[PDB]
Structure formats: structure tokens, C-alpha cells
Amino acid sequence: HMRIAQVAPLWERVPPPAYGGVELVVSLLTEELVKRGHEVTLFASGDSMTQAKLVSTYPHAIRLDPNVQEYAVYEALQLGEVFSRANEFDVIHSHVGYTALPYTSLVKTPVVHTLHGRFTADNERIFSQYRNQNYVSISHSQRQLRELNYIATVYNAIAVETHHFYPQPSDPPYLAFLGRLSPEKGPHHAIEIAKRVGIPLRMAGKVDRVDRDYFKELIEPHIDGEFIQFIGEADHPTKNALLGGAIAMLFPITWQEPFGLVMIESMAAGTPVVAIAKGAAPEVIEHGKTGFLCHSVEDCVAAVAQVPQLDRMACRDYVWQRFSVERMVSEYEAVYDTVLANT
Amino acid sequence: HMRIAQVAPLWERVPPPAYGGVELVVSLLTEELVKRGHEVTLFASGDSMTQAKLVSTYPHAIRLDPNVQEYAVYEALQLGEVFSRANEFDVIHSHVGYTALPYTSLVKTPVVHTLHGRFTADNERIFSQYRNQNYVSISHSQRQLRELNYIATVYNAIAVETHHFYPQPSDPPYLAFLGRLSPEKGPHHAIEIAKRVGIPLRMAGKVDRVDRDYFKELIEPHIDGEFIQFIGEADHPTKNALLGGAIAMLFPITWQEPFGLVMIESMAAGTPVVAIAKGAAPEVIEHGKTGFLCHSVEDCVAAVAQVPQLDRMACRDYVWQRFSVERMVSEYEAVYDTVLANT
Ligand SMILES: OC[C@H]1O[C@@](CO)(O[C@H]2O[C@H](CO)[C@@H](O)[C@H](O)[C@H]2O[C@H]2O[C@H](CO)[C@@H](O)[C@H](O)[C@H]2O)[C@@H](O)[C@@H]1O
Ligand SMILES: OC[C@H]1O[C@@](CO)(O[C@H]2O[C@H](CO)[C@@H](O)[C@H](O)[C@H]2O[C@H]2O[C@H](CO)[C@@H](O)[C@H](O)[C@H]2O)[C@@H](O)[C@@H]1O
Ligand SMILES: O=c1ccn([C@@H]2O[C@H](COP(=O)(O)OP(=O)(O)O)[C@@H](O)[C@H]2O)c(=O)[nH]1
Numbered sequence: 001h002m003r004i005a006q007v008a009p010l011w012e013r014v015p016p017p018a019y020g021g022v023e024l025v026v027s028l029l030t031e032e033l034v035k036r037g038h039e040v041t042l043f044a045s046g047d048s049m050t051q052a053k054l055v056s057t058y059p060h061a062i063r064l065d066p067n068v069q070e071y072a073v074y075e076a077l078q079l080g081e082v083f084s085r086a087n088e089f090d091v092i093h094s095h096v097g098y099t100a101l102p103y104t105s106l107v108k109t110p111v112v113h114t115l116h117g118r119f120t121a122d123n124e125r126i127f128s129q130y131r132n133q134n135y136v137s138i139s140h141s142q143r144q145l146r147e148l149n150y151i152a153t154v155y156n157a158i159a160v161e162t163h164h165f166y167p168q169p170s171d172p173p174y175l176a177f178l179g180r181l182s183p184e185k186g187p188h189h190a191i192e193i194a195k196r197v198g199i200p201l202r203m204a205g206k207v208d209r210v211d212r213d214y215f216k217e218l219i220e221p222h223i224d225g226e227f228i229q230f231i232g233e234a235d236h237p238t239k240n241a242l243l244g245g246a247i248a249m250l251f252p253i254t255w256q257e258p259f260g261l262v263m264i265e266s267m268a269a270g271t272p273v274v275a276i277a278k279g280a281a282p283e284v285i286e287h288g289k290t291g292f293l294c295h296s297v298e299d300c301v302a303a304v305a306q307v308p309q310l311d312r313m314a315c316r317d318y319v320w321q322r323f324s325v326e327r328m329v330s331e332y333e334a335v336y337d338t339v340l341a342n343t
Numbered sequence: 344h345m346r347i348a349q350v351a352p353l354w355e356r357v358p359p360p361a362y363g364g365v366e367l368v369v370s371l372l373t374e375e376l377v378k379r380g381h382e383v384t385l386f387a388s389g390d391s392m393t394q395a396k397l398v399s400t401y402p403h404a405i406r407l408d409p410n411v412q413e414y415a416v417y418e419a420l421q422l423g424e425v426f427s428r429a430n431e432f433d434v435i436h437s438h439v440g441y442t443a444l445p446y447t448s449l450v451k452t453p454v455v456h457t458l459h460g461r462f463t464a465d466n467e468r469i470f471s472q473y474r475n476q477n478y479v480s481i482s483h484s485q486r487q488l489r490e491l492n493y494i495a496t497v498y499n500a501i502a503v504e505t506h507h508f509y510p511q512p513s514d515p516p517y518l519a520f521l522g523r524l525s526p527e528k529g530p531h532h533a534i535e536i537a538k539r540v541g542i543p544l545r546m547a548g549k550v551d552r553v554d555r556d557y558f559k560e561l562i563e564p565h566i567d568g569e570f571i572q573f574i575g576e577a578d579h580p581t582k583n584a585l586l587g588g589a590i591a592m593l594f595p596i597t598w599q600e601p602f603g604l605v606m607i608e609s610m611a612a613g614t615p616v617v618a619i620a621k622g623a624a625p626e627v628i629e630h631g632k633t634g635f636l637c638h639s640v641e642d643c644v645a646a647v648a649q650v651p652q653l654d655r656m657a658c659r660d661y662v663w664q665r666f667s668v669e670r671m672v673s674e675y676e677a678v679y680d681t682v683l684a685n686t
């Protein structure tokens with residue numbers, strides 16, 4: 001009973017066939033909002049698949065499109081189209097970060113910003129200047145700047161029904177890594193953990209330009225092909241098989257993780273998570289039940305021996321209980337309600 | 344008699360102590376507008392030196408500042424500052440490129456955009472969408488998108504008086520290269536010309552992140568220390584001594600050059616330019632008088648024999664005649680009048 005604009009990043013399709021976190025959350029939120037009878041306009045790439053109105057400034061995902069060199073050009077096209085049409089919307093829900101803040105002061109339609117990223121020494125200064133806007137965080141640990149006007153915390157979610165549940169892991173045990181090959185995700189940690197426990201590690205993910213040196217130096221020399229396997233970038237079925245077959249997923253971050261969608265994807269498949277307790281991991285993992293919070297590699301190494309005891313079905317039930325689209329979209333509805341009323 | 348906003352890039356100080364083309368043009372334009380009684384607000388780094396109003400979102404030039412990783416944050420900070428105060432100005436003069444186009448449709452004060460860059464396969468798409476805006480080209484050959492509403496072509500200018508004139512080049516002859524060490528400027532070409540003419544080459548310029556590989560592979564292995572010299576980025580006095588002492592400046596571009604300030608800087612010192620006839624070279628160099636338009640390495644080599652034959656003093660007068668601050672600022676004043684009238 002509202003007109004809602006969803007402004008997504010253009011790096012990935014909505015929803016992404018493989019890598020993509022925000023575009024996934026935007027897809028789930030958008031589709032469910034439309035089902036609830038709202039007039040939704042999706043601002044996303046041209047190959048996106050939505051039942052809402054799709055306005056696109058480029059036909060394809062930009063990350064893997066070979067003809068595009070300047071992503072910022074089409075980002076600016078998107079924001080120009082959105083805020084030029086402000087009075088065609090009751091609320092604008094932006095997922096593109098700080099690039100939308102100077103536009104918000106120039107239009108009358110209220111804008112809601114879901115923060116999907118880490119606060120940095122630089123972006124804090126632009127967020128500071130626009131602190132009295134309606135931000136929504138995806139985890140409590142993310143709120144490192146309290147002077148911002150957080151309307152609410154709305155945890156992310158996945159479509160649990162679409163993830164196949166695995167009752168028992170693969171007959172010869174192996175560990176899984178799923179994520180972009182970045183130091184922030186610590187795949188080098190994951191490689192050390194598997195070698196010291198003696199259990200193989202299967203890796204999947206992208207290696208975009210910023211991590212090529214890191215992959216060339218720390219990761220690639222260790223990809224054995226037998227004990228350390230790497231299947232670059234995985235679509236939904238491939239990733240669902242990878243975590244499901246594993247006894248546990250290594251999530252050894254070295255970085256203030258905003259949320260970590262792979263964790264709830266692992267648990268949804270029934271595979272618990274051995275993670276280091278940084279950022280949102282303590283809020284996502286229930287220690288000793290759906291996984292194990294660790295503070296060191298050895299803590300993670302020791303925890304892998306206590307992984308078989310966990311109830312794998314409890315992991316899936318846990319994801320259903322707190323990380324469902326039903327709850328997320330309802331919480332996002334509460335946000336729109338508040339923003340339109342407390343203006 | 345107008346209130347004018349000057350929106351500069353933040354990579355370099357206004358004025359730049361060393362490298363910096365666009366930031367230099369903004370200085371001469373800003374100071375001269377103030378002298379003519381305009382209420383000018385300059386948006387640039389906090390260490391800028393202006394007699395106009397200085398609004399800064401970061402205190403220093405960002406290119407060499409080690410604490411900044413996200414330039415787009417402060418660019419957005421600046422663009423937010425300008426258009427939030429749009430009705431404090433009669434005209435906004437933007438030099439930051441396409442990132443300001445979506446703002447122009449959202450504010451009431453008319454905006455004039457000076458194009459300082461090359462049209463790209465990507466950036467063409469955002470300019471097309473905003474073609475009915477007030478663009479100003481710095482050369483006619485730059486107008487690769489004719490469908491834009493060009494108000495006028497306004498060639499750039501330099502402060503000729505600040506460049507010392509050199510009547511006779513250095514006693515043992517040498518060739519000069521001045522520019523960013525980029526393939527677009529073809530410094531490797533200049534080295535091919537050096538050995539074929541038998542005259543040494545003195546090189547000056549920056550090597551920023553994008554051209555470090557280009558530098559290590561194509562340029563650096565050839566730096567003798569005697570025949571090929573590189574003095575890593577030069578401030579104003581050093582670069583003027585570099586050009587003045589040279590018999591000619593090599594400008595072997597490989598790229599649709601928007602203008603090329605080093606060309607009128609070389610001539611200002613009295614040094615003619617051996618350039619490849621791409622982009623703005625035919626409009627900046629008077630062939631056979633202040634330099635030589637060339638079409639290959641061999642065509643440049645042949646021109647070096649005909650360089651001691653040109654009048655060096657005619658070069659300085661040429662820059663005074665067409666590329667003076669007086670002429671540029673008056674033409675930009677005419678542009679301001681037209682934009683305010685044909686609104
Ligand atoms: O401060 C580190 C900075 O890295 C970010 C930039 O916002 O990572 C994104 O950009 C890099 C490009 O180098 C990508 O490797 C990375 O996948 C990006 O992650 C974000 O952008 C994707 C595309 O939309 C989303 O799918 C993803 O959900 C999102 O995390 C940030 O992580 C961080 O701010
Ligand atoms: O189309 C090529 C693309 O290269 C640009 C990037 O926008 O070059 C600028 O940024 C590169 C680094 O990638 C620098 O080497 C270069 O100095 C830059 O040139 C422009 O930006 C400076 C800072 O404002 C100006 O001082 C300079 O005069 C200007 O040419 C662009 O040239 C272009 O878009
Ligand atoms: O090979 C991969 C690697 C990642 N993803 C997905 O892209 C999203 C990544 O989100 P996450 O929060 O876990 O990491 P980040 O956003 O910080 O890159 C998740 O849905 C992953 O399942 C994927 O499909 N394939």
C-alpha cells in the first residue's frame with residue numbers, strides 16, 4: 001500500500017547467479033515486498049529478474065561485463081533517475097552506500113539507507129556530516145558510529161527453502177571455504193586450519209582485481225589440487241553442495257564483518273560454522289550449538305574436533321528461526337512505517 | 344557582479360605546487376574573477392591559495408596523502424556542499440566531470456560544466472542522458488560527442504609572465520619530456536626519438552599507481568643516468584628550467600588529448616614542441632612556426648633537424664596571443680552571461 005523504490009548496486013544481477021550479497025538481499029526483500037501488495041520499482045541492472053518494475057541504466061552486471069570500464073558512470077545514472085522521480089515514491093530504500101547522501105538532502109521523499117559495509121576512516125566523515133538521516137544497520141557490532149540516526153537493526157536473511165539440507169557430511173571428511181578470496185575473509189587461515197587438523201579443504205569464490213596480488217602470493221601456491229581445492233566462483237547449486245558436504249565451514253575473518261551471508265547459508269545446509277569472533281559472527285553463530293566462536297587459528301583447529309557433536313538439523317532450524325525473509329521484510333516494513341510517520 | 348561557485352577536483356592543491364592541470368586552470372580563473380569584482384566561492388582542498396571564498400571538505404591534496412583511500416567520499420562531500428547552497432550563487436562552474444550532472448537537474452541555479460577529459464565508451468552514456476546541459480569544451484577536437492549542448496569552446500590558458508623566457512637553449516643540447524609518465528603521453532616514443540636523433544633526453548613527471556607497471560616495464564629499464572634522465576615530478580621553477588633549456592619538447596601522444604597544458608608551457612618558455620598530431624595538437628601548435636605536427640616517430644625525428652630553425656621568441660608571443668588568462672576569463676564571462684540569459 002506504499003510506493004517503494006529499491007536502489008541496488010550494479011556490480012551484480014538482482015539476484016546474482018553466483019557471487020553477490022547485497023543484490024541477493026535486495027532481491028529477496030524486493031520480491032517479498034511486491035507480494036505484500038506494494039508498488040515496487042527496482043533500480044538495478046538490466047538483466048535482473050524481478051516481478052516489480054525494473055528501471056536499468058545498463059543491461060548487464062558490471063563486474064563480469066567486459067565492455068564497461070567506469071562503474072561510477074552508471075552508478076551516477078542510477079541516482080539521477082531515482083531522485084528525479086522522487087515524488088513517484090513514498091520512500092526510497094538505498095543500498096549503494098554513502099553515494100546517496102548528498103542526494104537525500106535535495107529531495108523531499110524520505111530515504112532509508114541500509115548499511116551493508118564497514119565503517120572506514122574516510123567514510124565516517126561523510127556519514128558524520130549526514131548523521132540525521134535514516135540508516136538501518138544489519139548487525140549491532142556494525143554501529144561503530146553511534147552519532148548516526150539508526151532507525152533499527154534489521155538482520156539479513158536467505159531463502160532457506162531453496163537450500164538443500166544435508167543430514168550427514170561427505171563420507172571422506174573435508175572442510176569448506178566459501179567467499180571472495182580476500183584477506184578480510186582469511187582463506188589463508190582456512191588453509192592453515194585444514195593442514196594442521198589433517199582434513200582437506202575445498203574452496204570456492206571469486207578473485208576480483210583488488211585481491212589478485214593477495215591470491216597470487218598467499219593463496220595460490222597452496223592450492224594442491226588434492227588437499228587444497230579451489231573451484232573459482234560458485235552458483236547457488238554449486239555452493240549448496242560445497243558447504244553441505246563439509247563437516248564444517250571455516251569462517252576465519254580478520255576484519256569487522258558487517259554480517260556474513262555465507263554463515264547462514266552454511267547453517268541452512270546443516271553445516272555449522274567455525275568462525276573467529278569478529279564483527280557480527282557472535283550475533284550470527286550460537287556458540288556450541290550451530291557453530292563455535294574462536295579467537296585464534298588453534299581455537300578453530302581445536303573446535304573442528306568438536307564439530308561432529310552438533311545437531312545438524314538444529315542448524316537449519318536456527319536459520320529458519322532468526323534469518324528468514326518473512327521476519328526481515330516485516331522489520332523493513334516497520335522501518336518504512338516509522339520513517340513516513342516520524343518525519 | 345555575479346556570485347560564482349568554482350568546483351575543483353580534490354586530487355591537487357589549487358594551485359598545484361607540482362603536477363596538476365585542471366587545478367591550475369581553476370586558480371587562474373578564480374583569482375582573475377575575483378579581481379573583476381565577482382563574489383566567487385572556491386570549492387577545493389583546504390591548503391589551496393585563493394583570494395575567493397574557500398570551502399574545503401579535506402585539508403590536503405589527496406593524490407599524495409597517505410591517509411586517504413576513498414577519494415569518492417570527499418568528492419561527494421564537496422558536491423553535497425555546493426548544491427545544498429546552490430541558491431547562494433548565480434552560476435555554478437564545475438570542473439569535476441560527469442559526477443555533477445545528476446545534481447544539475449535537481450537544483451535551480453544553472454550549472455556550467457567545463458569538460459577536462461576524453462570521451463570514453465562508458466562516459467558517453469551519462470553525457471548523452473544530460474546533453475541539454477551547459478557544457479564548455481577546451482578544444483574543438485574534444486567534441487567527439489556532437490549531440491551535446493556546447494555553449495562555447497574556451498581554450499585553456501597559463502600565466503605566461505610566471506614562466507621565465509629562455510633566449511638560447513642549454514649549451515650542450517638536450518630534449519625535454521614533461522607530463523605524467525603514461526602511455527597516453529608516449530614517453531617511450533620520446534626515448535625512441537632520443538637515440539635516433541643522438542640528442543639526450545631529460546624527463547620530468549609523476550608516476551602514479553596506474554602507470555607503475557607501465558613505468559617498470561617500458562620506461563625505467565632505459566634510464567641510463569646520462570643519456571636518459573628522469574627527475575621524478577617537478578615543481579614550477581624546475582619544469583620551466585627543463586623546458587627553457589631544451590631545444591624542443593617531445594609531445595608524442597598516443598591518445599585523444601583534450602588540450603595539453605605542457606604545450607603552451609613549453610612555448611611560453613620559448614621552446615617549440617615536436618608533437619604527434621592527435622587531439623588538440625593541431626589547435627595548440629602552429630605547424631612550422633612554434634613547433635611541428637607529426638604523424639610517426641620518423642616524422643618527429645625529421646622535425647628535430649628543423650627545430651634550431653624556428654624563432655624561439657615567436658613561441659612566447661604566440662601563447663600571449665591566444666592562451667592568456669585575460670582571453671580565457673572573458674570568454675568564460677561571456678559563457679556565464681549566455682547561460683543566465685538563455686535560461
Ligand atoms: O573497505 C573495504 C571495502 O571493500 C568493499 C567495497 O565496498 O568490497 C566491495 O568492493 C570490492 C571491490 O574491490 C569487492 O571485492 C567486494 O566483493 C565488494 O563487496 C560488496 O560489493 C558487492 C557488489 O555489490 C556485494 O555483492 C557485496 O555484498 C558487498 O559486500 C567493501 O566490502 C568494503 O567497504
Ligand atoms: O580517460 C582516461 C582517464 O584518465 C584520468 C582519470 O579520470 O586521468 C586522471 O587520473 C589519472 C589516474 O588514473 C591521473 O594519472 C591523471 O593525472 C588524471 O588526469 C586528470 O586528473 C588530474 C586531477 O584532477 C588533473 O590535474 C589532470 O589535469 C587531469 O588530466 C582522466 O584523465 C581520464 O578520465
Ligand atoms: O563463490 C561464491 C562466493 C560467494 N557467494 C555468495 O555471495 C554472498 C557473499 O556475501 P557475504 O556476506 O558472505 O560476503 P561479502 O558481502 O562481504 O563479500 C553470499 O550469498 C555468498 O553465498 C557465491 O555465491 N559464490
Ligand SMILES: O=c1ccn([C@@H]2O[C@H](COP(=O)(O)OP(=O)(O)O)[C@@H](O)[C@H]2O)c(=O)[nH]1
Pocket residue numbers: 360361362363364365367521522523547548549575576577578579582602603604605606608
Ligand atoms: O612534473 C610535472 C609534471 C607535470 N606538471 C604539470 O601537470 C599539468 C598537466 O597538464 P596537461 O594538460 O599538459 O596533461 P594532463 O592534464 O592530461 O595530465 C601541466 O600543467 C604540467 O605543467 C608539472 O607541473 N610537473
